[PDB]
């Protein structure tokens, strides 16, 4: 009985931390920013693969639902 006290919260924290540009969605720019900050100098292509893996909206930004989905998918949360 997690309910309130659920992985959803942690996902949402990660979503916010990722969404540096505060689009309410995680963009390629956000992913690059995150990656660079961690040290991961990821390419356009690498990022677009990640994008495409999560994106089912065809807008190029990972929305909360998509993020939740892939976070579950990958056992990230």
């Amino acid at each position: 009985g997690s309910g309130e006290r659920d992985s959803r919260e942690e996902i949402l924290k990660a979503f916010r931390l990722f969404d540096d540009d505060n689009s309410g969605t995680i963009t390629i720019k956000d992913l690059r920013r995150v990656a660079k900050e961690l040290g991961e100098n990821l390419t356009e292509e690498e990022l677009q693969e990640m994008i495409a893996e999560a994106d089912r909206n065809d807008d190029n930004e990972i929305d909360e639902d998509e993020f939740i989905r892939i976070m579950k998918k990958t056992s990230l949360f």
Binding site: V34, E40, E49, M50, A54, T74, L76
Partner: peptide, 19 residues
């Protein structure tokens, strides 16, 4: 397995445990 290799990046961003 591209799927795995790509998922590994999402994994790595958050699981960036120092390394």
């Amino acid at each position: 397995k591209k799927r795995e290799l790509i998922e590994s990046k999402w994994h790595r961003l958050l699981f960036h445990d120092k390394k």
